[PDB]
């Protein structure tokens with residue numbers, strides 16, 4: 001009854017219900033998420049106010065679902081789910097060093113190598129008949145890239161290795177959203193314990209390598225270890241291991257899958273993308289850093305994919321004191337939900353919101369002002385945004401260079417929600433090599 005005055009109700013996901021409600025009830029709406037009343041805020045004025053300030057911090061009660069799942073510590077107090085500013089700021093600044101310009105440029109080989117491996121696997125299946133799950137294939141590529149890039153490990157999922165790990169990740173992701181029977185609880189808990197134990201194993205290996213005096217290239221793991229340099233235990237270290245292990249591939253994978261799915265019904269845009277890749281990189285097997293900037297139309301297409309299909313759909317901030325938010329009195333101690341998914345699909349912010357038009361992001365176009373934030377905004381924006389943007393460009397360019405994709409009829413364009421948003425179907429495609 002402290003929220004009853006707030007406007008709201010008395011392959012389709014919860015985020016679409018939020019969209020319906022935002023359109024019907026306005027820019028500040030009372031909802032239910034994780035059994036706590038929150039308020040969904042969809043004006044750009046409020047996006048700017050709350051996301052662009054260090055006065056407003058993440059709401060720990062909303063992130064509890066990431067911290068622990070059915071009594072098993074998952075993301076814990078790692079970089080995403082830490083809600084105390086000062087503890088967050090300490091780890092952010094140390095881990096930042098692994099995402100410097102020069103750190104990222106040195107990852108171009110890993111990106112090219114895994115992309116080339118994926119494409120060679122796909123080319124062998126390109127008979128215009130064999131159904132290929134592009135969701136699965138892109139997920140394996142994202143994982144292999146992340147494992148190598150962040151941790152110096154070879155998962156070899158593209159070779160069919162690590163099935164138990166891919167199961168662990170899948171069951172864990174389902175559990176996050178499920179917590180919003182007996183056998184599900186057992187499977188979820190064991191999967192989370194498995195992921196942390198992988199963490200312990202890889203950490204010990206890294207420590208052993210350093211002890212024996214072997215070469216260890218400075219990576220995300222190096223800075224994560226640095227962030228914990230005199231902690232009383234390894235729990236903080238394991239929290240970040242799991243956080244980056246998951247966050248570092250899941251959404252890149254989803255983003256790739258959504259893009260391939262959408263592009264399957266956009267032959268004109270595909271022909272333009274094929275033409276750009278042919279002109280910028282020709283037959284080069286390897287994309288250089290400077291080539292990435294020249295794939296301008298591809299950049300625009302990936303931005304438009306994220307407008308309609310943001311895998312990371314939202315973020316929460318704690319409103320501490322009663323505040324007037326677009327003409328609505330919102331009580332203190334209230335979680336505010338900001339959703340780039342909802343805003344992206346509102347005709348108030350985007351003309352013909354359901355039309356896929358890369359020209360929205362053209363060099364002369366008016367830039368969206370606080371209506372588009374697939375990597376969020378402000379101090380809690382995605383640390384891996386540029387890592388992600390580079391990796392998906394490399395993967396997309398290499399697919400476009402070499403293969404034609406047709407979505408198998410019956411495959412749907414609808415969404416599912418498992419912490420993140422992702423294609424409902426496995427994006428089954430048949431493939432042909434480019435050039436007949």
Ligand code: HEM
Nearest residue numbers: 079080247248251252312315374375376380382383384388
């Ligand atoms: C297209 C791919 C990606 C998308 C769409 C994305 C999106 C986001 C969003 C929306 C947030 C804010 C989360 C929140 O407020 O709760 C975030 C934060 C974060 N992301 Fe990503 N991300 C992507 C890729 C990555 C990658 C590749 C990494 C690591 C290699 C990563 C690691 C993180 C971390 C550690 C945070 C917390 C940052 C902080 O609070 O300081 N993400 N990301």
Ligand SMILES: O=C(c1cccnc1-c1ccncc1)N1CCC(O)(Cc2ccccc2)CC1
Nearest residue numbers: 062065080246247250251312313314315419420
């Ligand atoms: O922490 C994650 C995450 C969860 C699972 C896999 N990956 C990532 C992730 C990938 C890339 N960058 C950051 C993080 N996300 C993505 C989910 C939401 O945006 C909202 C959300 C908040 C609370 C509970 C569920 C959902 C939040 C932040």
